[PDB]
Amino acid sequence: QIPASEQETLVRPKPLLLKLLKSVGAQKDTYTMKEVLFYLGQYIMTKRLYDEKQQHIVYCSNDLLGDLFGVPSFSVKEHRKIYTMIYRNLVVVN
Ligand SMILES: O=C(O)c1ccc([C@H]2C[C@H]3[C@@H](N2)[C@H](c2cccc(Cl)c2F)[C@]2(C(=O)Nc4cc(Cl)ccc42)N3CC2CC2)cc1
Ligand SMILES: [Zn+2]
């Protein structure tokens, strides 16, 4: 479904996404999607927003991640949906 090339996409985060990213990783102007997914994953894990042994759901109603995505929770299995939510919070650079 998801191609390997997606993780090579170069992106400029919008301000709220950039704020989230800077709380877990070095600040730079441009990131790859691989970086954005790693850093968001680490944000989720460190903050214990992910209930793995509970239908694999991230709960974000009480966190800026919920403002970023516009949902109170989401399944981590729904990669296509997660990409869409992330895409809306960045500009692709080419
Ligand atoms: O048993 C399954 O069937 C199963 C179990 C787990 C996953 C999940 C865990 C991982 C990864 N796959 C997921 C992911 C990686 C690449 C691209 C995408 Cl679109 C993606 F969603 C990721 C991640 O690595 N970064 C990131 C960032 C956000 Cl915003 C949301 C979720 C994640 N998950 C981190 C985990 C803390 C929640 C998928 C299926
Ligand atoms: Zn399971």
mmCIF file of all heavy atoms in Angstrom, residues 67-89:
data_model
loop_
_atom_site.group_PDB
_atom_site.id
_atom_site.type_symbol
_atom_site.label_atom_id
_atom_site.label_comp_id
_atom_site.label_asym_id
_atom_site.label_seq_id
_atom_site.Cartn_x
_atom_site.Cartn_y
_atom_site.Cartn_z
ATOM 1 N N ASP A 67 -4.287 18.485 18.861
ATOM 2 C CA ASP A 67 -4.546 19.723 18.122
ATOM 3 C C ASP A 67 -3.977 19.629 16.709
ATOM 4 O O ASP A 67 -4.618 20.101 15.751
ATOM 5 C CB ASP A 67 -3.979 20.924 18.856
ATOM 6 C CG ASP A 67 -4.625 21.095 20.204
ATOM 7 O OD1 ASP A 67 -5.861 21.182 20.240
ATOM 8 O OD2 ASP A 67 -3.922 21.044 21.224
ATOM 9 N N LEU A 68 -2.797 19.030 16.595
ATOM 10 C CA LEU A 68 -2.090 18.854 15.315
ATOM 11 C C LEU A 68 -2.903 17.972 14.373
ATOM 12 O O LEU A 68 -3.117 18.309 13.197
ATOM 13 C CB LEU A 68 -0.731 18.182 15.562
ATOM 14 C CG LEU A 68 0.289 18.038 14.422
ATOM 15 C CD1 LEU A 68 0.982 19.346 14.086
ATOM 16 C CD2 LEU A 68 1.329 16.977 14.762
ATOM 17 N N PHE A 69 -3.378 16.848 14.903
ATOM 18 C CA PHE A 69 -4.139 15.888 14.125
ATOM 19 C C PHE A 69 -5.636 16.060 14.053
ATOM 20 O O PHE A 69 -6.280 15.448 13.187
ATOM 21 C CB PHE A 69 -3.781 14.483 14.622
ATOM 22 C CG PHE A 69 -2.439 13.978 14.208
ATOM 23 C CD1 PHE A 69 -1.509 14.722 13.458
ATOM 24 C CD2 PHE A 69 -2.092 12.694 14.558
ATOM 25 C CE1 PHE A 69 -0.301 14.178 13.145
ATOM 26 C CE2 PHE A 69 -0.870 12.127 14.203
ATOM 27 C CZ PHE A 69 0.015 12.867 13.488
ATOM 28 N N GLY A 70 -6.240 16.836 14.950
ATOM 29 C CA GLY A 70 -7.665 17.054 14.931
ATOM 30 C C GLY A 70 -8.529 15.881 15.397
ATOM 31 O O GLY A 70 -9.714 15.883 15.128
ATOM 32 N N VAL A 71 -7.934 14.926 16.121
ATOM 33 C CA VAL A 71 -8.617 13.744 16.640
ATOM 34 C C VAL A 71 -8.242 13.558 18.110
ATOM 35 O O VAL A 71 -7.130 13.942 18.524
ATOM 36 C CB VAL A 71 -8.253 12.470 15.829
ATOM 37 C CG1 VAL A 71 -8.707 12.625 14.367
ATOM 38 C CG2 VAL A 71 -6.784 12.177 15.948
ATOM 39 N N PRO A 72 -9.149 12.949 18.916
ATOM 40 C CA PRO A 72 -8.830 12.625 20.309
ATOM 41 C C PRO A 72 -7.945 11.341 20.454
ATOM 42 O O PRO A 72 -7.339 11.110 21.500
ATOM 43 C CB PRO A 72 -10.211 12.417 20.931
ATOM 44 C CG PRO A 72 -11.030 11.867 19.799
ATOM 45 C CD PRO A 72 -10.531 12.556 18.566
ATOM 46 N N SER A 73 -7.945 10.503 19.406
ATOM 47 C CA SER A 73 -7.210 9.240 19.381
ATOM 48 C C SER A 73 -7.176 8.707 17.954
ATOM 49 O O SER A 73 -7.959 9.161 17.068
ATOM 50 C CB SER A 73 -7.852 8.219 20.328
ATOM 51 O OG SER A 73 -9.166 7.862 19.927
ATOM 52 N N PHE A 74 -6.247 7.774 17.731
ATOM 53 C CA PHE A 74 -6.121 7.102 16.452
ATOM 54 C C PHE A 74 -5.401 5.755 16.625
ATOM 55 O O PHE A 74 -4.615 5.525 17.545
ATOM 56 C CB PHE A 74 -5.454 7.995 15.402
ATOM 57 C CG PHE A 74 -4.049 8.370 15.734
ATOM 58 C CD1 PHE A 74 -3.008 7.561 15.321
ATOM 59 C CD2 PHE A 74 -3.750 9.492 16.485
ATOM 60 C CE1 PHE A 74 -1.713 7.852 15.625
ATOM 61 C CE2 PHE A 74 -2.424 9.822 16.779
ATOM 62 C CZ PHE A 74 -1.383 8.982 16.338
ATOM 63 N N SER A 75 -5.738 4.838 15.751
ATOM 64 C CA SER A 75 -5.028 3.557 15.698
ATOM 65 C C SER A 75 -3.690 3.743 15.014
ATOM 66 O O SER A 75 -3.635 4.303 13.914
ATOM 67 C CB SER A 75 -5.846 2.558 14.903
ATOM 68 O OG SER A 75 -5.090 1.380 14.592
ATOM 69 N N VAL A 76 -2.612 3.218 15.604
ATOM 70 C CA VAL A 76 -1.289 3.308 14.982
ATOM 71 C C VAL A 76 -1.116 2.414 13.752
ATOM 72 O O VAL A 76 -0.078 2.527 13.076
ATOM 73 C CB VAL A 76 -0.124 2.998 15.945
ATOM 74 C CG1 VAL A 76 -0.160 3.962 17.130
ATOM 75 C CG2 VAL A 76 -0.183 1.515 16.367
ATOM 76 N N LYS A 77 -2.087 1.527 13.503
ATOM 77 C CA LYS A 77 -2.078 0.619 12.331
ATOM 78 C C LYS A 77 -2.509 1.338 11.056
ATOM 79 O O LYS A 77 -2.311 0.801 9.977
ATOM 80 C CB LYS A 77 -3.029 -0.575 12.528
ATOM 81 C CG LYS A 77 -2.748 -1.429 13.765
ATOM 82 C CD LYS A 77 -3.587 -2.678 13.825
ATOM 83 C CE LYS A 77 -3.244 -3.554 15.028
ATOM 84 N NZ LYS A 77 -3.932 -4.891 14.974
ATOM 85 N N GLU A 78 -3.144 2.506 11.181
ATOM 86 C CA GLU A 78 -3.759 3.183 10.031
ATOM 87 C C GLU A 78 -2.747 4.143 9.441
ATOM 88 O O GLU A 78 -2.882 5.361 9.533
ATOM 89 C CB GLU A 78 -5.027 3.925 10.472
ATOM 90 C CG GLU A 78 -6.133 2.964 10.897
ATOM 91 C CD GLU A 78 -7.438 3.663 11.223
ATOM 92 O OE1 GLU A 78 -7.456 4.907 11.317
ATOM 93 O OE2 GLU A 78 -8.460 2.956 11.366
ATOM 94 N N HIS A 79 -1.706 3.578 8.821
ATOM 95 C CA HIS A 79 -0.591 4.382 8.291
ATOM 96 C C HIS A 79 -1.029 5.397 7.242
ATOM 97 O O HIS A 79 -0.583 6.518 7.262
ATOM 98 C CB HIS A 79 0.494 3.478 7.722
ATOM 99 C CG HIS A 79 1.402 2.875 8.759
ATOM 100 N ND1 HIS A 79 2.592 2.341 8.433
ATOM 101 C CD2 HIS A 79 1.270 2.732 10.138
ATOM 102 C CE1 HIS A 79 3.210 1.905 9.553
ATOM 103 N NE2 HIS A 79 2.388 2.094 10.586
ATOM 104 N N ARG A 80 -1.913 5.010 6.346
ATOM 105 C CA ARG A 80 -2.383 5.976 5.318
ATOM 106 C C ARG A 80 -3.062 7.208 5.944
ATOM 107 O O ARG A 80 -2.755 8.358 5.557
ATOM 108 C CB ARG A 80 -3.286 5.302 4.288
ATOM 109 C CG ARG A 80 -2.520 4.447 3.297
ATOM 110 C CD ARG A 80 -3.405 4.072 2.095
ATOM 111 N NE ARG A 80 -4.599 3.350 2.520
ATOM 112 C CZ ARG A 80 -5.598 2.841 1.769
ATOM 113 N NH1 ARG A 80 -5.580 3.061 0.456
ATOM 114 N NH2 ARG A 80 -6.613 2.159 2.289
ATOM 115 N N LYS A 81 -3.912 6.975 6.967
ATOM 116 C CA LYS A 81 -4.527 8.062 7.733
ATOM 117 C C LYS A 81 -3.497 8.913 8.467
ATOM 118 O O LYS A 81 -3.648 10.126 8.532
ATOM 119 C CB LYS A 81 -5.576 7.556 8.748
ATOM 120 C CG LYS A 81 -6.469 8.655 9.328
ATOM 121 C CD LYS A 81 -7.223 8.206 10.572
ATOM 122 C CE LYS A 81 -7.994 9.324 11.230
ATOM 123 N NZ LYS A 81 -8.712 8.891 12.461
ATOM 124 N N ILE A 82 -2.499 8.285 9.094
ATOM 125 C CA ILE A 82 -1.471 8.986 9.805
ATOM 126 C C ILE A 82 -0.652 9.888 8.858
ATOM 127 O O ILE A 82 -0.380 11.069 9.155
ATOM 128 C CB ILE A 82 -0.571 7.998 10.593
ATOM 129 C CG1 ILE A 82 -1.381 7.399 11.746
ATOM 130 C CG2 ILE A 82 0.643 8.723 11.149
ATOM 131 C CD1 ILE A 82 -0.842 6.086 12.328
ATOM 132 N N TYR A 83 -0.326 9.350 7.682
ATOM 133 C CA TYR A 83 0.368 10.170 6.673
ATOM 134 C C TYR A 83 -0.451 11.413 6.320
ATOM 135 O O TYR A 83 0.106 12.497 6.233
ATOM 136 C CB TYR A 83 0.689 9.389 5.395
ATOM 137 C CG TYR A 83 1.969 8.588 5.462
ATOM 138 C CD1 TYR A 83 1.967 7.200 5.304
ATOM 139 C CD2 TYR A 83 3.169 9.225 5.686
ATOM 140 C CE1 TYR A 83 3.162 6.478 5.358
ATOM 141 C CE2 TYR A 83 4.350 8.505 5.734
ATOM 142 C CZ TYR A 83 4.330 7.169 5.591
ATOM 143 O OH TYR A 83 5.530 6.486 5.660
ATOM 144 N N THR A 84 -1.751 11.241 6.120
ATOM 145 C CA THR A 84 -2.649 12.365 5.747
ATOM 146 C C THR A 84 -2.621 13.430 6.852
ATOM 147 O O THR A 84 -2.477 14.603 6.559
ATOM 148 C CB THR A 84 -4.061 11.878 5.481
ATOM 149 O OG1 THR A 84 -4.042 10.994 4.359
ATOM 150 C CG2 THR A 84 -5.004 13.019 5.164
ATOM 151 N N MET A 85 -2.763 13.002 8.092
ATOM 152 C CA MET A 85 -2.739 13.933 9.244
ATOM 153 C C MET A 85 -1.431 14.667 9.362
ATOM 154 O O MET A 85 -1.403 15.869 9.636
ATOM 155 C CB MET A 85 -3.083 13.169 10.537
ATOM 156 C CG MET A 85 -4.502 12.709 10.547
ATOM 157 S SD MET A 85 -5.064 11.952 12.105
ATOM 158 C CE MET A 85 -3.947 10.559 12.300
ATOM 159 N N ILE A 86 -0.332 13.992 9.088
ATOM 160 C CA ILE A 86 0.968 14.611 9.121
ATOM 161 C C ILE A 86 1.101 15.567 7.930
ATOM 162 O O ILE A 86 1.597 16.701 8.097
ATOM 163 C CB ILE A 86 2.113 13.560 9.116
ATOM 164 C CG1 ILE A 86 2.154 12.779 10.413
ATOM 165 C CG2 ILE A 86 3.474 14.248 8.929
ATOM 166 C CD1 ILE A 86 2.995 11.515 10.318
ATOM 167 N N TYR A 87 0.694 15.130 6.738
ATOM 168 C CA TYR A 87 0.835 15.968 5.542
ATOM 169 C C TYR A 87 0.194 17.324 5.691
ATOM 170 O O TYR A 87 0.697 18.318 5.143
ATOM 171 C CB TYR A 87 0.221 15.306 4.315
ATOM 172 C CG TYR A 87 1.199 14.513 3.479
ATOM 173 C CD1 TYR A 87 1.098 13.123 3.380
ATOM 174 C CD2 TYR A 87 2.171 15.150 2.713
ATOM 175 C CE1 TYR A 87 1.992 12.400 2.634
ATOM 176 C CE2 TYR A 87 3.088 14.425 1.986
ATOM 177 C CZ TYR A 87 2.972 13.050 1.917
ATOM 178 O OH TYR A 87 3.828 12.274 1.140
ATOM 179 N N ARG A 88 -0.945 17.356 6.374
ATOM 180 C CA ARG A 88 -1.658 18.611 6.575
ATOM 181 C C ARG A 88 -0.909 19.600 7.475
ATOM 182 O O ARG A 88 -1.349 20.777 7.567
ATOM 183 C CB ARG A 88 -3.052 18.321 7.130
ATOM 184 C CG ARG A 88 -3.950 17.632 6.112
ATOM 185 C CD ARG A 88 -5.323 17.324 6.660
ATOM 186 N NE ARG A 88 -6.184 16.643 5.668
ATOM 187 C CZ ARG A 88 -7.245 15.909 6.010
ATOM 188 N NH1 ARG A 88 -7.587 15.799 7.314
ATOM 189 N NH2 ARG A 88 -7.978 15.296 5.083
ATOM 190 N N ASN A 89 0.149 19.152 8.139
ATOM 191 C CA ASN A 89 0.919 19.959 9.053
ATOM 192 C C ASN A 89 2.334 20.270 8.506
ATOM 193 O O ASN A 89 3.233 20.659 9.282
ATOM 194 C CB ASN A 89 1.045 19.226 10.369
ATOM 195 C CG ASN A 89 -0.227 19.296 11.197
ATOM 196 O OD1 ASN A 89 -0.597 20.389 11.699
ATOM 197 N ND2 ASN A 89 -1.019 18.207 11.170
#
